[PDB]
């Protein structure tokens, strides 16, 4: 119910993370594949999602609209399986694409951290962690994936 | 069948560890949602 960051479990194992804001649960498509979720005794049903963006929202439309300003450091609020939530600050790089630049964080956390929020200095969620690339040395870089509100 | 459990408040931490580089990478995004390096 409450706003905050949540683990997504399969009954049990943590397969991802998401954000509750304004009554809507936000995670990455690859975490749930649009399957329904349980929250206590209640059920959350998918409302909106997009495979190409790798995003899904439950119980309402996508609510997170803050954007990286292209200049400032950000914080990954990483929620790794089996570990407490922790903040890691970084200066994003960028994914240069044919459709514009996307901020990208060179931070490597396990599969089940997918959906962890990335924050600006005001604590607003500027996107979700966990859709990325592997560079030549094996290192990972995640897009700052944000939906449209 | 999957379920959610609260893990924390969404806040910036003043003390936070700072790490990671800032790469500028040429990337493509396919219709399946996979990024790849060009």
């Amino acid at each position: 119910t409450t706003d905050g960051v949540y683990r997504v479990m399969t009954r049990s194992t943590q397969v991802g993370v998401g954000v509750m804001q304004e009554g809507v649960f936000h995670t990455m498509w690859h975490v749930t594949k649009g399957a329904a979720l349980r929250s206590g005794e209640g059920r959350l049903d998918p409302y909106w999602g997009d495979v190409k963006q790798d995003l899904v929202s439950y119980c309402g439309p996508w609510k997170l609209d803050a954007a990286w300003d292209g200049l400032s450091e950000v914080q990954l609020l990483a929620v790794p399986p089996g570990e407490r939530a922790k903040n890691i600050q970084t200066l994003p790089g960028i994914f240069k694409t044919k459709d514009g630049d996307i901020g990208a964080v060179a931070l490597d956390y396990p599969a089940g951290t997918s959906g962890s929020p990335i924050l600006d200095k005001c604590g607003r969620v500027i996107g979700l962690y966990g859709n990325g690339v592997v560079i030549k040395n094996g290192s990972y870089v995640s897009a700052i994936t944000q939906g449209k509100r | 069948d999957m379920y959610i459990e609260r893990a924390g408040d969404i806040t910036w931490e003043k003390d936070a560890e700072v790490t990671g580089n800032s790469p500028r990478l040429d990337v493509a995004l396919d219709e399946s949602g996979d990024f790849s390096l060009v």
Binding site: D108, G130, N131, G132 | -
Partner: peptide, 6 residues
Amino acid sequence: KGXXKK
């Protein structure tokens, strides 16, 4: 990463 890039 570790389900590949996810």
